[PDB]
Amino acid sequence: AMADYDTYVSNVQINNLSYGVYTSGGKETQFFCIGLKHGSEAISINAMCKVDVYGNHKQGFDNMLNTAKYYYTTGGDVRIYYKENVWRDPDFKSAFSSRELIAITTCSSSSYCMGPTVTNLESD
Amino acid sequence: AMADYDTYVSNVQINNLSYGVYTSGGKETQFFCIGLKHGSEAISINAMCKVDVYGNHKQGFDNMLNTAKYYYTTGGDVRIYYKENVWRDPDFKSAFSSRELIAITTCSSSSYCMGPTV
Amino acid sequence: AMADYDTYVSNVQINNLSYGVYTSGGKETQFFCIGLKHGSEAISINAMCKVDVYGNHKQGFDNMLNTAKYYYTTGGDVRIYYKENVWRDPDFKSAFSSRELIAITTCSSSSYCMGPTV
Amino acid sequence: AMADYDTYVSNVQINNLSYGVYTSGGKETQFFCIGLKHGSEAISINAMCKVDVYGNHKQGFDNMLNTAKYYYTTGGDVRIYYKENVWRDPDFKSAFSSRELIAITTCSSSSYCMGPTV
Amino acid sequence: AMADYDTYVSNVQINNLSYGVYTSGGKETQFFCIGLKHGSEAISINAMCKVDVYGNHKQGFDNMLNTAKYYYTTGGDVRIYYKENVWRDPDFKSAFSSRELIAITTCSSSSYCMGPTV
Numbered sequence: 157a158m159a160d161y162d163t164y165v166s167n168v169q170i171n172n173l174s175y176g177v178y179t180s181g182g183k184e185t186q187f188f189c190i191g192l193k194h195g196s197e198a199i200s201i202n203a204m205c206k207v208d209v210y211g212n213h214k215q216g217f218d219n220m221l222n223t224a225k226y227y228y229t230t231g232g233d234v235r236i237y238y239k240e241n242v243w244r245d246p247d248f249k250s251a252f253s254s255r256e257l258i259a260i261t262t263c264s265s266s267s268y269c270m271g272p273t274v275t276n277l278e279s280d
Numbered sequence: 281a282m283a284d285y286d287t288y289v290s291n292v293q294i295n296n297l298s299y300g301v302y303t304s305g306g307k308e309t310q311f312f313c314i315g316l317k318h319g320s321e322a323i324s325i326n327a328m329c330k331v332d333v334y335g336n337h338k339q340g341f342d343n344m345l346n347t348a349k350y351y352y353t354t355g356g357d358v359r360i361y362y363k364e365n366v367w368r369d370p371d372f373k374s375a376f377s378s379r380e381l382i383a384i385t386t387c388s389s390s391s392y393c394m395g396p397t398v
Numbered sequence: 399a400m401a402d403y404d405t406y407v408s409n410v411q412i413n414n415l416s417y418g419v420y421t422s423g424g425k426e427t428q429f430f431c432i433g434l435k436h437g438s439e440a441i442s443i444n445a446m447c448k449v450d451v452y453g454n455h456k457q458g459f460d461n462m463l464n465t466a467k468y469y470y471t472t473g474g475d476v477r478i479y480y481k482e483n484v485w486r487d488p489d490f491k492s493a494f495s496s497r498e499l500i501a502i503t504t505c506s507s508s509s510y511c512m513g514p515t516v
Numbered sequence: 517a518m519a520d521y522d523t524y525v526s527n528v529q530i531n532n533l534s535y536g537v538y539t540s541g542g543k544e545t546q547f548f549c550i551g552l553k554h555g556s557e558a559i560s561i562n563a564m565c566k567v568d569v570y571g572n573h574k575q576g577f578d579n580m581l582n583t584a585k586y587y588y589t590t591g592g593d594v595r596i597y598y599k600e601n602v603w604r605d606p607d608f609k610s611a612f613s614s615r616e617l618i619a620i621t622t623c624s625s626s627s628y629c630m631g632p633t634v
Numbered sequence: 635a636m637a638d639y640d641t642y643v644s645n646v647q648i649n650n651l652s653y654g655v656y657t658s659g660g661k662e663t664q665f666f667c668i669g670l671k672h673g674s675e676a677i678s679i680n681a682m683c684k685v686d687v688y689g690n691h692k693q694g695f696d697n698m699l700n701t702a703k704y705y706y707t708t709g710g711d712v713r714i715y716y717k718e719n720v721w722r723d724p725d726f727k728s729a730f731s732s733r734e735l736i737a738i739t740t741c742s743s744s745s746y747c748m749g750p751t752v
């Protein structure tokens with residue numbers, strides 16, 4: 157399976173966005189975070205962030221930001237791939253999220269979203 | 281004829297888009313992939329991808345991504361030029377396809393899209 | 399708490415924008431500034447600026463400019479994090495402001511904006 | 517007069533766009549082409565291209581692409597400045613055009629578009 | 635006062651735009667120029683331009699171009715800050731003007747625009 161593509165949430169909408177600058181560990185960083193809803197329902201996995209100079213994948217900051225802004229604007233249905241337990245600074249985690257944003261794919265219907273899905277119920 | 285312009289599908293619409301970051305073959309990549317429809321017709325050749333650090337043509341990642349995103353927004357008719365059998369990462373190929381996106385042109389009628397047809 | 403996130407205003411709207419190039423303190427700079435709406439007044443309050451080559455955070459100039467331009471376009475409610483007493487060029491501070499923009503987050507309701515609170 | 521500004525078509529609309537990646541003369545290129553209409557009047561001078569690493573002016577690839585995409589979206593009236601007989605790749609010239617795109621200006625009426633005239 | 639901010643026109647709209655590539659004084663340049671109106675009337679102070687590799691402030695070419703494009707789209711009321719007597723290529727100044735674009739700020743009423751006044 158595609159490494160780092162095993163945890164996602166499907167058929168959500170990006171309903172909040174944050175962008176900011178922040179000093180961490182002696183490095184000047186940019187970050188953004190997305191907030192999610194599932195139609196009129198609140199979900200448990202509802203926020204995720206990307207940081208330009210930290211994380212498992214530092215590439216693609218601007219392309220990911222522009223993609224997140226696009227879907228916040230359209231309100232379209234998406235699948236968000238994310239990684240747990242990446243941001244470990246507790247004050248950033250409290251303020252924003254611990255999860256790193258990995259990918260954003262579209263859902264053209266209530267039953268199809270683009271991108272890899274887990275093999276089976278146990279992700280063997 | 282133009283090398284790598286011999287394989288295309290015309291008058292399709294980009295109806296899905298994926299963008300992500302991913303480690304492939306020991307390298308940090310960005311990729312995007314487009315999903316296609318042709319109205320209500322059943323199509324099998326329906327997904328094409330571009331990767332920033334792999335492929336026959338590594339240039340133009342941002343410009344191709346922004347172009348693909350534009351036509352996803354409009355839903356307009358386009359021609360997709362692509363190359364078969366490029367992606368060798370088995371997990372990536374299974375999730376998307378082996379096809380590399382080469383070019384996107386517009387179609388202004390049922391009978392015309394820009395670019396070569398030979 | 400997150401350093402530089404202690405001072406903010408919530409559920410505000412950006413009603414004016416400035417972008418320019420300017421020589422300050424012997425350096426060539428770009429800057430932009432946002433003005434915030436107060437009631438029905440035309441004149442903005444609480445202006446905040448970012449400068450490409452000066453400030454506590456020089457990174458993110460283009461992304462912050464594009465974010466500010468976005469919310470000026472939509473008129474949506476946002477929370478703005480900023481730092482007081484940053485710009486020391488007296489002509490610039492008099493013309494625009496002495497505050498430096500740190501972050502912009504959305505407010506999805508009258509009681510919730512993303513980001514940390516005090 | 518401004519060199520390379522002597523040949524233009526006025527009050528046209530950009531009604532087609534192409535963007536692709538391509539190996540030409542042994543070098544990796546990006547290119548884009550614009551296709552034109554003139555309302556309902558038949559126009560033969562109807563396609564112009566720009567290439568990132570070839571041409572009389574290599575600068576401004578992304579800005580010219582983004583400008584062309586802008587006018588394709590709006591359908592607004594523009595003047596196109598171009599140079600004939602530029603592209604030496606015969607496969608490219610037959611697929612797209614020989615003409616190099618030099619400038620795009622707007623037209624605010626049927627008689628006025630910005631820029632120099634002959 | 636802020637150097638280079640003393641000369642401006644207020645409550646204008648950007649009603650034309652030019653973008654092109656051009657060889658000037660032996661250098662390969664990009665430029666753009668803005669055309670203005672003053673509501674229902676013409677204004678004879680016009681055609682302010684920015685050049686990527688010449689001028690008093692060469693930074694911010696892309697951000698100024700994108701900002702100009704934005705106000706051309708919205709038609710919003712703006713103040714333009716500019717510097718007189720900059721461009722010395724006689725063919726360029728005859729086709730456009732000699733004025734270097736310095737800043738664009740918004741106007742929220744018929745009597746207020748952001749930025750300093752004389």
Ligand SMILES: CC(=O)N[C@H]1[C@H]([C@H](O)[C@H](O)CO)O[C@@](O[C@H]2[C@@H](O)[C@@H](CO)O[C@@H](O[C@H]3[C@H](O)[C@@H](O)[C@@H](O)O[C@@H]3CO)[C@@H]2O)(C(=O)O)C[C@@H]1O
Nearest residue numbers: 304305306309331333334335336366367368369370372373
């Ligand atoms: C996203 C992705 O699929 N990336 C994989 C890439 C791309 O498929 C490829 O670069 C596109 O052109 O392929 C990777 O594996 C290649 C690499 O191991 C080279 C090294 O020799 O071999 C390539 O296959 C060769 C083969 O070895 C030759 O003998 C002959 O058969 O031709 C083929 C041409 O493909 C591998 O594809 C890569 O690292 O480049 C792995 C990426 O994950």
Ligand SMILES: CC(=O)N[C@H]1[C@H]([C@H](O)[C@H](O)CO)O[C@@](O[C@H]2[C@@H](O)[C@@H](CO)O[C@@H](O[C@H]3[C@H](O)[C@@H](O)[C@@H](O)O[C@@H]3CO)[C@@H]2O)(C(=O)O)C[C@@H]1O
Nearest residue numbers: 640641642643644645646672676677678679713744745752
């Ligand atoms: C370089 C320079 O002189 N800039 C001044 C400009 C120019 O003189 C003017 O734009 C050239 O046409 O004028 C500035 O003041 C004008 C501005 O406040 C506009 C706002 O709409 O009003 C102009 O007054 C109008 C007036 O309100 C009308 O009733 C009528 O009387 O005509 C005049 C002309 O339009 C003000 O002159 C400017 O900011 O544009 C001041 C600049 O310093």
Ligand SMILES: CC(=O)N[C@H]1[C@H]([C@H](O)[C@H](O)CO)O[C@@](O[C@@H]2[C@@H](O)[C@H](O)O[C@H](CO)[C@@H]2O)(C(=O)O)C[C@@H]1O
Nearest residue numbers: 658659660685688689690720721722723724726727
């Ligand atoms: C677009 C344009 O007009 N470019 C001019 C350029 C600009 O006018 C100038 O750099 C902006 O400050 O001026 C050029 O020519 C001259 C210089 O060679 C010389 O150093 O000084 C001259 C004035 O006394 C004049 O500016 C230039 O910088 O090369 C010519 C160029 O086409």
Ligand SMILES: CC(=O)N[C@H]1[C@H]([C@H](O)[C@H](O)CO)O[C@@](O)(C(=O)O)C[C@@H]1O
Nearest residue numbers: 422423449452453454484485486487490
């Ligand atoms: C736009 C502006 O005000 N720039 C001024 C900066 C900023 O105030 C600080 O860089 C903020 O951290 O301060 C200076 O003293 C400096 O650093 O040399 C002078 C300069 O003119």
